[PDB]
Subunit: 256 residues, 4 copies
């Protein structure tokens, strides 16, 4: 209730899924939270539910939406301590020959450039507060995934960008870190599975891809984010894996 | 004060340095802590200072000392939730030709096999409590260090062993993680620097090896350990870097 | 002279620097090489110098240039075995607040989407030949670099995309790998250094960033590419570091 | 036939499996090779088969055997250019509680300290020739394996030690690299599979653990070793993965 008291946090894509879990974790740590989302439904309800959270409609691909997000956060709360760049999307499975450069550009706009834009607009305020940036990347940026060339590329970019920005902002006392979740049970996961021939088999395989034998929860990503914001004062440029061990060991992926 | 309430933690090498910082962090989180050390001086004083911590003399290279450590922890506190394998040593700088197989074996006994032995003896109790293991490795296991072949090898072993054991213990609900610190200001760091021709220059270089421009503190490693024990329920087999960004970018290490 | 005899290779950005070194290495291995470049000067001279190499003017950011590159390679040589995606650029040092989303998009077009486009257009022919893709990424995609947020992000994307595509193309026998060079002495390196206040000091620091004490040569990247094409039949999705050890150890990047 | 002509190479464990593949690759590159093995059967036959290879009986865990190996190589051939530390063993699957500290020490003696000892004794000669060291580690040192805590730890140690030694030997022009194979079809693989309830199912799973859908060959590890010795002049401290993509993507390893 006090580990991040007095602090102001912006969470993009905070209306459902991982983002909502991060919002809840920060509120529970004593922070005031601005929920940014392009969809009103979840975020508005979350603002009614949580004292200490408010909702601002903002599409992170629209530069003027993001400018207004930052200026309204400062106008309403007087400071900015942490930006969590969580908004992102995973397209349906797509074989490489079924992808397009224009779909790839669109996905870069959301998963990479939206993170870049908010971070850039927020950094002057983060420098004043010795605040920090937390980017939500993905394990698959590090190890790859099948039928997801554009998505994987966007997350490799986010993880790398996190390290570059950590170097650039270190002289100013602003830490920049990322979290790479594995399979987290969210509405995106449920929507992707529903597209498959056997959604139940897809979900079962998703649970068993982790040594821990289940998928992760938004609250577990949220606790990692609160740690990075509030207690990881010597961590910058790290990639914190929240994956249940999926990257470990051999699996289902004589010498001729 | 309550994030790890009711839990029992063993910290090896807990009498000074990083270990003492981890002890303090766990006590502050509400746990009872057993301080294991081969040196009475720091650990006994820490037991007097901290309600909730007690000291047990134990050299982790001596199997019967470790057996007694575990059986006394259970006899006195009734459960075991977390083992922090922190005891270890860094020899003075040694060029490869100045090392010996027998010095290498001795360092393996402490930095690797002591961690192995306590973990093995503790695992039956950790399974009962769905507890966890935290090994203190080192950034240099991942990236190397000059004049430290044996030390580097021992830490590469610890980090790898953490992943193997995480796979083996996942079916039983026991997580196994490691922390890889960079330069942390401790009595070991101070003792190593005092051996150098210009200790002050060695310390200054140590501070500047991190983008953050300072060395880390035992309390920062301690906060990472408390996160891994108490809030990282979907993390297993991870290497949590607490290094101030030392692994990032180019440094001081035309084409002929 | 025979390790890649009978094979046809396309090298983008092959007119100078690393690309020209890769062209020479493949010609020396017995392959026929198509030099792609947006600049006529170096590539045309290279075509006159090397029997077995020909030059095709092609800007990899222009989809119809790339379509013609592939169709002319097939029309003239009857097969395609290897694509080396080397074309790319490093902007001058830019602090994060001096970058723009539109500059970032432009750099993505070259360093990431040009690689994507040629690969996509080439893959039907690579499947027929059980050929392979080699992407030239950068060490800084993995470890970060200062004053280079957009560049670093593009190379993290390339390395990640390499892994995704390796997964997707494995059933078809097409390997996809990348090379991550460190400091290689090329016209780009020389042009960037000339912008600095003391170019000589910048170059000296560049040599000393590697434990080997020099920068690398285009011929060394070329030999790595020939290995990946011709002899690495069980390697797919790898990142082959050609960096002189720059990522190893501590450098120039008490606890307060 | 000439890429490593005039050079002298020592391959430990060269009598069968990967080691024999490395021996053959170096002979085919024009080098003279000393086959070291503790077993006479395979190595003696290989010496009869290959002009340019000779067999020396040597157990790498016995320091005086290794001293004689080096002194006989110099006496007979006048120089030493490359050491390949391939000798090693994988115990049968062992749950953590079934391992022992004394078995762990024994495995460290072979997989880690034998590599250390030969390297140390060879380095004075490698400095004279600006030669290089190649250690055969394992992918599982990096990602873990189930039922193999001691083996995994030994290979994490080898990979880390490679980086440390690369730093130490860089001023002297001696490169130190490792190869991390995945599943390679060798007599060790066949012997381990024969211990399983269904050896055929174990082998089938082993083939399918790689995106490439087969296991690797000793000749493929051998080609990687020849590349590292003869053409990778700007590579030091690298871990070259020869794994068929096993580390990529998700596999067989809702949120409660
Ligand atoms: N779920 C997983 O398994 C998983 C794994 C790894 C990484 N991730 C990453 O975690 C993040 C959140 O994923 P999730 O599963 O919670 O997704 P989700 O679809 O359940 O929730 C995403 C939220 O972001 C919002 N959003 C989307 N586009 C936006 C835009 N342009 N501007 C503002 N808000 C926008 C959506 O409206 C939604 O509320 C994403 O970056 C995703 O890539 C998810
Ligand atoms: N200080 C750093 O910069 C740094 C960096 C990376 C990793 N580490 C690791 O962190 C750990 C702690 O290092 P530190 O700097 O705090 O060291 P330290 O020497 O200051 O403290 C180590 C403690 O361990 C105890 N210990 C040593 N051998 C023991 C044994 N056989 N049995 C029981 N206790 C024993 C010592 O008595 C001491 O109290 C070590 O594993 C070290 O390798 C330290
Ligand atoms: N030089 C280094 O230290 C270094 C380090 C790591 C990675 N790299 C990468 O290696 C690659 C080559 O770098 P370099 O140093 O040789 O650069 P360079 O500038 O010396 O040569 C690049 C070549 O690519 C061509 N090119 C540029 N844009 C193109 C386009 N749109 N279409 C076609 N050709 C185009 C240029 O005309 C030139 O001939 C780049 O991808 C770079 O990011 C270089
Ligand atoms: N086969 C795989 O899938 C695989 C995968 C990753 C790593 N590796 C590593 O590759 C190396 C070779 O493995 P392999 O599968 O070819 O094994 P193998 O058992 O088929 O051959 C090993 C050879 O080393 C010799 N050897 C063993 N102990 C020795 C000693 N004390 N002194 C000298 N020689 C000794 C054996 O007699 C034998 O000829 C090992 O280090 C192993 O850990 C193998
Ligand atoms: O970033 C990630 C996003 C994820 O979303 C989902 C959800 C359901 C299925 C899939 C999926 C699995 C295999 C291939 C593929 O293209 C997928 F989209 N990903 C899953 C894991 C991640 F690390
Ligand atoms: O595990 C580590 C242990 C460390 O201890 C120290 C302390 C002072 C100096 C050194 C040191 C620096 C360079 C070479 C060397 O051999 C050293 F011991 N390490 C420093 C960093 C780590 F990641
Ligand atoms: O991809 C790379 C590209 C490189 O180009 C150059 C050349 C000269 C200077 C720099 C440079 C150094 C520090 C910061 C920065 O922004 C630079 F551009 N990079 C150097 C290393 C790489 F890995
Ligand atoms: O170093 C390695 C050594 C290997 O040997 C073998 C051979 C057959 C089975 C196994 C194996 C598989 C799963 C668990 C386990 O304990 C094994 F030994 N490893 C396989 C892969 C490696 F990377
Ligand atoms: O839709 C899948 C899951 O999404 C998560 O974000 C919600 O917190 C869960 O209640 C829900 O089951
Ligand atoms: O000796 C160096 C440092 O060691 C740390 O463990 C102590 O907490 C500090 O008070 C001390 O300055
Ligand atoms: O311009 C720097 C260097 O670029 C390389 O590509 C050329 O091969 C060298 O001859 C030149 O010195
Ligand atoms: O025993 C399994 C395999 O081992 C390899 O080292 C040999 O080259 C193969 O001929 C054999 O099939
Ligand atoms: Na509210
Ligand atoms: Na006490
Ligand atoms: Na020509
Ligand atoms: Na012979």
């Amino acid at each position: 209730g006090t580990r991040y008291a007095g602090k102001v946090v912006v969470v993009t894509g905070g209306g459902r899924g991982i983002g909502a879990g991060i919002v809840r974790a920060f509120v529970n740590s004593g922070a005031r939270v601005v929920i940014c989302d392009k969809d009103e439904s979840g975020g508005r309800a979350l603002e009614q539910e949580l004292p200490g959270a408010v909702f601002i409609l903002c599409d992170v691909t629209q530069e003027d939406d993001v400018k207004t997000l930052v200026s309204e956060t400062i106008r309403r709360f007087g400071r900015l301590d942490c930006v969590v760049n969580n908004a992102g999307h995973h397209p349906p499975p797509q074989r490489p020959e079924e992808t397009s450069a224009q779909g790839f550009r669109q996905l870069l706009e959301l998963n990479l450039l939206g993170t870049y834009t908010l971070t850039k607009l927020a950094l002057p305020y983060l420098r004043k507060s010795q605040g920090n940036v937390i980017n939500i990347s993905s394990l698959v940026g590090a190890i790859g995934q099948a039928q997801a060339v554009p998505y994987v590329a966007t997350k490799g970019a986010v993880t790398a960008m996190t390290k570059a920005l950590a170097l650039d902002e270190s002289p100013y006392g602003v830490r920049v870190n990322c979290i790479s979740p594995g399979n987290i049970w969210t509405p995106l996961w449920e929507e992707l599975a529903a597209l498959m021939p056997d959604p139940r088999a897809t979900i079962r395989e998703g649970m068993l891809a982790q040594p821990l034998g289940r998928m992760g929860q938004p609250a577990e990503v949220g606790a990692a984010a609160v740690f990075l914001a509030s207690e990881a004062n010597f961590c910058t440029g790290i990639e914190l894996l929240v994956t249940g061990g999926a990257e470990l060991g051999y699996g289902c992926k004589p010498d001729i």
